[PDB]
Swiss-Prot record:
Residue span(s) of domain Globin: 1-142
Cited function: Serves to transport hydrogen sulfide to autotrophic bacteria.
List of residues that carry N-acetylserine: 1
Identification of the protein by name: Hemoglobin-1
Binding annotation for heme b: 96
């Protein structure tokens, strides 16, 4: 399910993306929005009706990339701690469900992120495994 090597690659590659997140965060969001238009739709409120092509350098974009980074960092720091993962996962799921976001959409986001992490030395198979363990804690609450 999740080997020691897989955890190690996830933690290391995350430390590298994290040091670059000021520029990489918005690029990840754009990759996601281009791949899934239905995902972009859920942010219409935050972006005030603006077209997708115009959002990358907005102050809203910047805040949203910082939000994303703070939860991902928490999860990566607790890979050997199922109890801690479950708690964060529950809050996360409750807040997103309340917005009418589906388990399928969350899953799409983890897929885009696993591909994106190849740039920071991430093993896509290690990122996919981590996503499968997290989704197993989230799905039951969606
Ligand atoms: C790996 C998957 C995801 C991560 C880490 C993530 C993380 C977060 C966090 C930490 C927040 C701010 C805390 C909160 O109010 O909930 C958040 C906000 C939000 N997320 Fe996500 N999320 C992801 C997936 C999504 C997905 C796929 C969508 C869209 C379909 C999305 C839509 C939103 C929106 C609409 C907000 C509220 C934005 C605002 O007005 O401040 N999130 N997400
Ligand atoms: S998000």
């Amino acid at each position: 399910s999740l080997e020691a090597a897989q955890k190690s690659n996830v933690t290391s590659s995350w430390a590298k993306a994290s040091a670059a997140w000021g520029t990489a965060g918005p690029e990840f969001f754009m990759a996601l929005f281009d791949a899934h238009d239905d995902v972009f739709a859920k942010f219409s409120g935050l972006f005030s009706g603006a077209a997708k092509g115009t959002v990358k350098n907005t102050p809203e974009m910047a805040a949203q990339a910082q939000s994303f980074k703070g939860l991902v960092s928490n999860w990566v720091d607790n890979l050997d701690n199922a109890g801690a993962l479950e708690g964060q996962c529950k809050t996360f799921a409750a807040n997103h469900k309340a917005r009418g976001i589906s388990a399928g959409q969350l899953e799409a986001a983890f897929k885009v992120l696993s591909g994106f992490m190849k740039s920071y030395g991430g093993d896509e198979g290690a990122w996919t495994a981590v996503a499968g363990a997290l989704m197993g804690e989230i799905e039951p609450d969606m």
